[PDB]
């Protein structure tokens, strides 16, 4: 067939072969400078694990010399070797690279429903209190939030950044020091082969669900979608949502939407109850303005999360009213230049493909069809306007192309007009065909941020989103 179908067949063989007997696509996270530097400071100060401190040191010098990250991580690494503005300032101040923010102590107090950030902010408040010479400011309720960091085994919520920050604060408290020695050995045992510390354990639920959705969109889905659907359903949280990895109690809208869309196609009867629980999770999260937050109701709705929820809930005609209110939220927030806004992904094309899917996926007629089509046209027009010469897109309009940013654009463009020769979609598919590597896969710069806008690299996502693009476009 075409070179695109040939490329799609080769990539699908690779994704299927990577799924394990347990029905999961392994998706480890690469080492990151910020957490490696925090692990280096924690172990150095506790005078523990000399083998890991040397490997962490060699990793940091090598990474700065051959592949330096954002300026913030470089300064964090350099300080160790030799609300979000408040969090990053306090981190650098805790390492001695700047002064502590002269803010009221309540600025570090955040809502508990964002569990990861809540523990992170509490640890930095403790570090700021001790760092400025006011240890007596720390309340008992502040210490109690960091208690999960002293539990043995993998990091609480698979978040190495959260545990490292909480441990750096807990070592200042003699009441919590008895439990510090054991976890220090667990922390030092997490080093990747390159001597670095990953941000998270992985993203296996997110990756398996996105891979299964792509496989279920092929002309003939492989049989492995059933054990993949089983492995996802048995990992659901009590509230019906899904975390990004095994053992993540904080469900989120993005992970739930990918699982829900996958289960809807590959096992709507086999996992009828899991499907119903995920829809109930999304609807209990919905905001009165029609949008959807990321984690907890009462926090700000987001375009990407609202569009993803609109597409996921659109399969049930019982939910036509909530789905239409969500799509209207998307139209209401389209920028004057046709874009929407970044979020968990750092490229512009991500929110574009989520919005276009909701705009062209939900059945609509009359005045609403006109309004939704015009919003979809302006979004697809923004893609064609910012397309690079080689046929791909980057993180931003002037950035070099990468397969993942281009994959998002292809999914959006696949809902537009037919691919004519030389058209924007045709050249995008040709860019993806050229960038396929002999082993059948793709290697791309990462686009996931956490904590925003700090990037982290889960390499297995390159193959998954490119396959999702090729399945949508063929």
Swiss-Prot record:
Binding, Mg(2+) 2: 120
GO molecular function, one term: metal ion binding
Residues reported to bind Mg(2+) 1: 120
Start-end of each PFTB repeat: 225-267, 275-317, 323-366, 376-417, 425-468
Result, substituting residue 116 to A: Reduced activity to 64%
Highest taxon, organism lineage: Bacteria
Cystine crosslinks: none
Entry keywords, A to Z: Isomerase, Magnesium, Metal-binding, Repeat
Coiled-coil annotated spans: none
Active site: 254
EC number: 5.4.99.-
Cofactor binding: number and manner: Requires a divalent metal cation for activity. The highest activity is observed in the presence of Mg(2+), but the enzyme can also use Ni(2+) and Co(2+) in vitro, while is inactive with Mn(2+) and Zn(2+). Binds a binuclear Mg(2+) cluster coordinated with Glu-120 and the diphosphate moiety of FPP.
Outcome of swapping residue 114 to A: Reduced activity to 60%
Function: Catalyzes the cyclization of farnesyl diphosphate (FPP) to drimenyl diphosphate. Cannot use geranylgeranyl diphosphate (GGPP) as substrate.
Family in the record: Belongs to the terpene cyclase/mutase family.
The protein's name in its UniProt record: Drimenyl diphosphate synthase
